[PDB]
């Protein structure tokens, strides 16, 4: 069976078994607590096909995390605006960060992945080698002790949370090796099934590919674990239409040269091949 | 309805049937699956395994010891619970490069992370009053004030403190959730020894869920157990196979015997397990 069926099955489960739950945004959701799906990474890449995923956003965001950037502008300049509202003058001021430059998200993913526990100053500070470089640690451990059961990168940092523009959804991930295959499990505390989760599966599948490449291993599985898995009330009808679509076989991800360290990957090193997502169809709602 | 213990028993079977041989830190070797998830209802029952006795006394005294912030193995040892004693021993501490540490001093393990995340650890006797993040009370305050919140997390995985810990935490984080007046908890356990650890760990986090449900005026919902490396040690295969032949009987009940207002105020005598009479733990003899 096609891996995307697992996603569709989760969407169906929430539509059928989920409870209505109010949320932070005021939008409302149908929600289930606790879900898990497994996406093979073997000779295919799980970029969902029943609705186009913003792959450009996935890849530039991840390269921004890796370089340790906490500057929304450094992502925005690549045409990816996902962090912009959280770095805006008015949003930063709303949190009491009037001293910050526009774009300064505080100690979010890039900073935690590369400098966990360092004292955050501003997004322009030199953190060269302060704090824990979890990303490099994970990579070193996979190479030296691939049986290790502690190969973890954690972005959830309770001491730092109040300085972040928003709290991390991807609380931690763990890697694992057996049979020359590298697998990753993501603990995602909160998943927008219609709009966030497909991008999220692609982000951590890519990270797996990148690390497998550096460490000389084959991608195995990406296990996706959710806390509050929810469908926003506004996405219920679109996802009903989507659930009726037959997934197309997943694309392949190609890495276009031999890359030796995680810091050396660049956007042009990657190719998604054979990505055939369903075209959108117009749907009307009326009262 | 299908008994909740069947979730655990099915995981053990799945590992035995579909797990890969995987070498490990101890040198024993394991059968291993990466990524599993079970759900244990906590509604009118308490998931203490009936097919093999679980060390309940240990579960309860250990949790109370976490809640009070203790990182001293001796404080738990005096309760007759020796589970952390070897990791606080002179010899073990010295092996880790902690020759100056007092016997019993585990470093900034769960107790410390749950009550004081981010404080600078000195030793087990230091006053950390008002230092770091008290994530345990913050969880409880959030459940009370904004139960819909999607960030109710307590995290013991602290990369900065890891090198000071006697051992790295297996229960990396947990998350709480509220719906329909019911409190649920999900545990992300990075490594589970299905034979020896997991039964105990299910009970600890189901117990934590009952305590917090009690303080917050909610009914226990589900405990969702998520595993990273779910493994059976090669020396536990034959015992587990015996255990798998055992029919599950009804899980017991947990009663809390008084009205407790804050988490720090729970005491051992506040708890009663009713209707627990498990099969004995499994011992096998072989002439080799
Ligand atoms: O990578 C991401 C980031 C956010 N969200 C969704 C989950 C929630 O719908 C919302 C975050 O709001 P809270 O969980 O913080 O309330 O964004 C995702 O699905 N994936
Ligand atoms: O609460 C606990 C603590 C430990 N373990 C098991 C998992 C591993 O078998 C071993 C820990 O070793 P590492 O995962 O750290 O190698 O103990 C548990 O199951 N539960």
Q: Is the CB of A24 under 6 A from ligand 1?
A: yes
At how many Å resolution was this determined?
Answer: 1.7
- Residue B79 in contact with residue B61, Cβ under 8 Å? yes
What are the pocket residues of ligand 2 if the criterion is a CB atom closer than 6 Å to any ligand atom? A 149-150; B 25, 168, 170, 191-193, 197-198, 201
Say which of A117, A147, A228 has its CB closest to residue B23: A147
| Atom number of ligand 2 nearest to Cα B196 | 19
CB within 8 Å: B190 and A149: yes
- Residue A23 in contact with residue A190, Cβ under 8 Å? no
For chain A, give every domain's residue range.
1-287
SS3 content of chain A, % helix, strand, coil (to 5): 35, 25, 45
Residues 6+ apart with CB under 8 A from B7: B38, B39, B40
Say how far apart CA B124 and CA B102 lie, in whole Å: 8
CA–centroid distance, B49 to ligand 1, in Å, is: 36
Residue A231 counted as an annotated binding residue: yes
- Residue A158 in contact with residue B155, Cβ under 8 Å? yes
Q: Is the CB of A200 under 6 A from ligand 1?
A: yes
Say how far apart CA B15 and CA B179 lie, in whole Å: 32
Q: What are φ and ψ of residue B5, in 5° steps?
A: -65, -30
Q: What are φ and ψ of residue B270, in 5° steps?
A: -75, -10
Q: Which residue of B has its CA nearest to A22?
A: B148
Q: Which helix (H) or strand (E) holds A113?
A: helix A109-115
Say which of A34, A152, A159 has its CB closest to residue B224: A34
Following DSSP, what letter does each residue of chain B receive, concatenated?
---THHHHHHHHHHHHHHPEEE--TTSS-EEEEEEEEEEEE-SS-----SSS---HHHHHHHHHHHHTT--BHHHHHTTT--TTTGGGSHHHHHHTT-TTSPTTB--S-HHHHHHHBT-----TTS--TT-SB-HHHHHHHHHHH-TT-S--EEE---TTTGGGSSS--SEEEEEEEEETTEEEEEEEEEEEETTTTHHHHHHHHHHHHHHHHHHHT-EEEEEEEEEEEEEEEGGGHHHHHHHHTSPP----EEEE-S---SGGG--GGGEEEES--PPPP-------
Closest to A165 measured CA to CA, from A98, A87, A110, A100: A87
**Residue that the structure tokens 């003899």 belong to:** B285
Q: Which helix (H) or strand (E) holds A201?
A: helix A197-215
Q: Which ligand is nearest to the CA of B191?
A: 2
- CATH for A1-287 is 3.30.572.10
A101 Cα to chain B: minimum distance (Å): 26
Distances from the Cα of A216 to the Cα of A45, A149, A181, angstroms: 18, 19, 9
Considering the candidates B18, B155, B170, B185, report the single residue annotated as catalytic: B170
Give the tokens for residue B237: 């295969």
- Residue A260 in contact with residue A210, Cβ under 8 Å? no
| Atom number of ligand 1 nearest to Cα A193 | 19
CA–centroid distance, A197 to ligand 2, in Å, is: 30
Closest to A55 measured CA to CA, from A72, A85, A78: A78
CB within 8 Å: A172 and B172: yes
Q: Is the CB of A28 under 6 A from ligand 1?
A: no
| Atom number of ligand 2 nearest to Cα B24 | 16
Following DSSP, what letter does each residue of A62-85 receive, concatenated?
HHHHHTT--BHHHHHTTT--TTTG
Q: Which residue of A has its CA nearest to B120?
A: A117
- Residue A276 in contact with residue A49, Cβ under 8 Å? yes
Nearest CA, atom 18, ligand 1: A196
Secondary-structure class of domain B1-288 per CATH: alpha beta
Numbered residues of chain A with Cβ closer than 8 Å to any chain B Cβ: 19, 21-24, 31, 33-36, 38, 116-117, 131-132, 134, 147-150, 152, 154, 156-159, 167, 171-172, 174, 176, 178-179, 183, 185, 187, 189-190, 220-221, 223, 225, 227-228
Say how far apart CA A92 and CA A110 lie, in whole Å: 18
Q: Which ligand is nearest to the CA of A190?
A: 1
Give the tokens for residue A218: 């084959």
Say which of A34, A132, A189 has its CB closest to residue B150: A189
Say which of A24, A152, A223 has its CB closest to residue B34: A223
Say which of A19, A34, A149 has its CB closest to residue B180: A19
Top residue of A6, A130, A179, A225 to mutate, by most chain B CBs within 10 Å, is A225
Active site residue A154: no
Say how far apart CA A179 and CA A146 lie, in whole Å: 10
Collapse the DSSP code of A45 into the 3-class scheme (helix H, G, I; strand E, B; otherwise coil) and give the result.
coil
Q: How many CA atoms lie within 13 A of B224 on its CB side?
A: 25
Q: Is the CB of A103 under 6 A from ligand 1?
A: no
Q: Which residues of B touch A22 (CB under 8 A)?
A: 148
Residue A234 counted as an annotated binding residue: no
- B202 φψ region: left (φ > 0), alpha (ψ -120 to 50), beta (else): alpha
Q: Which residue of A has its CA nearest to B169?
A: A150
Q: Which residues of A touch B226 (CB under 8 A)?
A: 34, 36, 187, 225
**Residue that the structure tokens 């995602």 belong to:** A188
CA–centroid distance, A230 to ligand 1, in Å, is: 10
Q: Which residues of A touch B118 (CB under 8 A)?
A: 157-159
Q: Which helix (H) or strand (E) holds A209?
A: helix A197-215
Say how far apart CA A176 and CA A165 lie, in whole Å: 31
Q: Which experimental approach was used here?
A: X-ray
Give the tokens for residue A286: 């009326």
| Atom number of ligand 1 nearest to Cα A23 | 16
């Amino acid at each position: 069976r096609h891996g995307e069926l697992q996603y569709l099955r989760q969407v169906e489960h929430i539509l059928r078994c989920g409870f209505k739950k109010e949320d932070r945004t005021g939008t409302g959701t149908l929600s289930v607590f606790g879900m898990q799906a497994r996406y093979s990474l073997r000779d295919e890449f799980p970029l969902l096909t029943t609705k186009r995923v913003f792959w450009k956003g996935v890849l530039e965001e991840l390269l921004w995390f890796i370089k340790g950037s906490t500057n929304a502008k450094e992502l925005s300049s690549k045409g990816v605006r996902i962090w912009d509202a959280n770095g805006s003058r008015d949003f930063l001021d709303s949190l009491g960060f009037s001293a910050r430059q526009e774009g300064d998200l505080g100690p979010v993913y890039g900073f935690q992945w590369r400098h966990f526990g360092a004292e955050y100053k501003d997004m322009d500070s030199d953190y060269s080698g302060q704090g824990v470089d979890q990303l490099q640690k994970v990579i070193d451990t996979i190479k030296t002790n691939p049986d290790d059961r502690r190969i973890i990168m954690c972005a959830w940092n309770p001491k730092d949370l109040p300085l972040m523009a928003l709290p991390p959804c991807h609380a931690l991930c763990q890697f694992y090796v057996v049979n020359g295959e590298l697998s990753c499990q993501l603990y995602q505390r909160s998943g927008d099934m219609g709009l966030g989760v497909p991008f999220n599966i692609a982000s951590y599948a890519l990270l797996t590919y990148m690390i497998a490449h550096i460490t000389g291993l084959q991608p195995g599985d990406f296990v996706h674990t959710l806390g509050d898995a929810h469908i926003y009330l506004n996405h219920i009808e679109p996802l009903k239409i989507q659930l009726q679509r037959e997934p197309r076989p997943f694309p392949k991800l190609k890495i276009l040269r031999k890359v030796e360290t995680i810091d050396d990957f660049k956007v042009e090193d990657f190719q998604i091949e054979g990505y055939n997502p369903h075209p959108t169809i117009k749907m009307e709602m009326a009262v």
